[PDB]
Amino acid sequence: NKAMINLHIQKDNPKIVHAFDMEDLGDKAVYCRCWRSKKFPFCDGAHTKHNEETGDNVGPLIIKKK
Amino acid sequence: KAMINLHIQKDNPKIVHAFDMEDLGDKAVYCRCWRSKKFPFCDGAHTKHNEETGDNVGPLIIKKKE
Numbered sequence: 001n002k003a004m005i006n007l008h009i010q011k012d013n014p015k016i017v018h019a020f021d022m023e024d025l026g027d028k029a030v031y032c033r034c035w036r037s038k039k040f041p042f043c044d045g046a047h048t049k050h051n052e053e054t055g056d057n058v059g060p061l062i063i064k065k066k
Numbered sequence: 067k068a069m070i071n072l073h074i075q076k077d078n079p080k081i082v083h084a085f086d087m088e089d090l091g092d093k094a095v096y097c098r099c100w101r102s103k104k105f106p107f108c109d110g111a112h113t114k115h116n117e118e119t120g121d122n123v124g125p126l127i128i129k130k131k132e
C-alpha cells in the first residue's frame with residue numbers, strides 16, 4: 001500500500017469516478033477495475049497482462065441483463 | 067510486488083463479478099481500488115489510498131435514470 005494503482009489515466013482529475021444509467025447500457029457492459037485499459041472505464045483485457053506480469057488476480061466488473 | 071490487489075480473495079486467480087441490472091437498487095457503487103472491506107462494493111477506502119499514494123482512483127456507479 002505504497003504504490004499508485006492508476007499510473008496514467010486522467011491524472012488532472014483528482015478522483016476518477018464514472019456513473020452510468022442502467023437504462024443506457026446495452027445487454028452488457030464490462031468495466032475495468034485494473035486501470036490498465038486503453039478504453040477506460042471499459043475493460044479491454046489489459047488485466048491479463050497485468051496479472052501475468054505482477055502475479056495479481058484482478059479482473060473486470062460485468063453489468064448485464066438477466 | 068507491483069500488484070493492485072493486496073488482500074482480496076487471493077485463492078481466486080482472477081476476480082470477476084457479474085450482476086444483473088434487474089437485481090440492482092436505485093444506485094450501486096462498485097469498488098475500483100481493491101481496498102474496500104465490502105468488495106465488490108465501495109466503502110470509501112479509496113480516499114485513504116489516494117491520500118497515502120498520491121493516486122486518484124474512485125468508484126463506478128450504476129444507477130437508475132432520473
Ligand SMILES: O=C(Nc1scc([C@@H]2CCc3ccccc3C2)c1C(=O)O)c1ccccc1
Binds near residue numbers: 030043046060082084
Ligand atoms: O476479459 C474480458 N471479458 C470478460 S472476463 C469475464 C467475462 C465474464 C465471463 C463469464 C460470464 C458469464 C455470464 C455473463 C457474462 C460473463 C462475462 C467477460 C466478458 O463478458 O467480456 C475481455 C477480454 C478482452 C477484451 C474485452 C474483454
Ligand SMILES: O=C(Nc1scc([C@H]2CCc3ccccc3C2)c1C(=O)O)c1ccccc1
Binds near residue numbers: 124
Ligand atoms: O456515491 C458515492 N460516492 C460518490 S458519488 C460522487 C463521488 C465523487 C465524484 C467525483 C469527485 C471529484 C472530486 C472530489 C469528490 C468527488 C466525489 C463519490 C465518491 O465516493 O467519491 C458512494 C460511495 C460509497 C457508498 C455509497 C455511495
Ligand code: FES
Binds near residue numbers: 032059
Ligand atoms: S482491462 Fe482492466 S479489468 Fe480488464
Ligand code: FES
Binds near residue numbers: 097102113123124125
Ligand atoms: S472503496 Fe474502492 S473505489 Fe471506493
